[PDB]
Amino acid sequence: EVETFAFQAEIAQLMSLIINTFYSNKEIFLRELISNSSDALDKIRYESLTDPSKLDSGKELHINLIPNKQDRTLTIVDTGIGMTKADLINNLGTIAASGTKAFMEALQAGADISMIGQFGVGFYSAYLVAEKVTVITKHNDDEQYAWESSAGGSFTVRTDTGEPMGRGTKVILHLKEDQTEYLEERRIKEIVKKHSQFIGYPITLFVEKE
Ligand SMILES: [Cl-]
Ligand SMILES: [Mg+2]
């Protein structure tokens, strides 16, 4: 079963704004997705202080950045708390209706697209660079799921029975044809050093075969 859902009007609005607005500083998508991974890793860290068994699905708390030039994908993987099916359907755990409203109001009062993360909807900045985003997630409380959307108003959710992840979330960006600089090692290193240099978990940038 693949289930197909409509984005709530606010999110469809937000996604169309991200896709259509001329805005050159697209590189902030990676800061926003690393930020979301850090917040998910903080959540499982906190739960484990009182219940160490929550780490039976993997003790290591880390983020991996995986470029793949053959597939035109950049994947951000973390071993944070992951999301349940209900969280995926509910705007990937975000308060995206109210966040979208506050972000629009801020843009009127002089903010710019790079401030999106302040409003709790930074995930959607993926659409600055990707034509399609796939999110694979596993929470201790639930099965592994894949969410997917190429925007256009709808997203799908389906049980994933690809390679099991112990716990956490993988964001797979299928990059736009003109945004392949974000698969280049030196470009990813530069962005991590510029915007994510104090994140409190290891960030490993994977190498590709020649
Ligand atoms: Cl909300
Ligand atoms: Mg925060």
From Swiss-Prot:
Subcellular location field: Nucleus; Cytoplasm; Melanosome; Cell membrane
PTM-bearing positions, type N6-acetyllysine: K43, K69
Coiled-coil zones: none
Region (Interaction with NR3C1): 1-210
UniProt PTM comment: ISGylated. S-nitrosylated; negatively regulates the ATPase activity and the activation of eNOS by HSP90AA1.
Chain residues that bind ATP: N36, D78, A97, F123
Domain of life: Eukaryota
Family that this chain belongs to: Belongs to the heat shock protein 90 family.
Job description of the protein: Molecular chaperone that promotes the maturation, structural maintenance and proper regulation of specific target proteins involved for instance in cell cycle control and signal transduction. Undergoes a functional cycle that is linked to its ATPase activity which is essential for its chaperone activity. This cycle probably induces conformational changes in the client proteins, thereby causing their activation. Interacts dynamically with various co-chaperones that modulate its substrate recognition, ATPase cycle and chaperone function.
Domain text: The TPR repeat-binding motif mediates interaction with TPR repeat-containing proteins like the co-chaperone STUB1.
Subunit structure: Homodimer. Identified in NR3C1/GCR steroid receptor-chaperone complexes formed at least by NR3C1, HSP90AA1 and a variety of proteins containing TPR repeats such as FKBP4, FKBP5, PPID, PPP5C or STIP1. Forms a complex containing HSP90AA1, TSC1 and TSC2; TSC1 is required to recruit TCS2 to the complex. The closed form interacts (via the middle domain and TPR repeat-binding motif) with co-chaperone TSC1 (via C-terminus). Interacts with TOM34. Interacts with TERT; the interaction, together with PTGES3, is required for correct assembly and stabilization of the TERT holoenzyme complex. (Microbial infection) Interacts with herpes simplex virus 1 protein US11; this interaction inhibits TBK1-induced interferon production.
Name of protein: Heat shock protein HSP 90-alpha
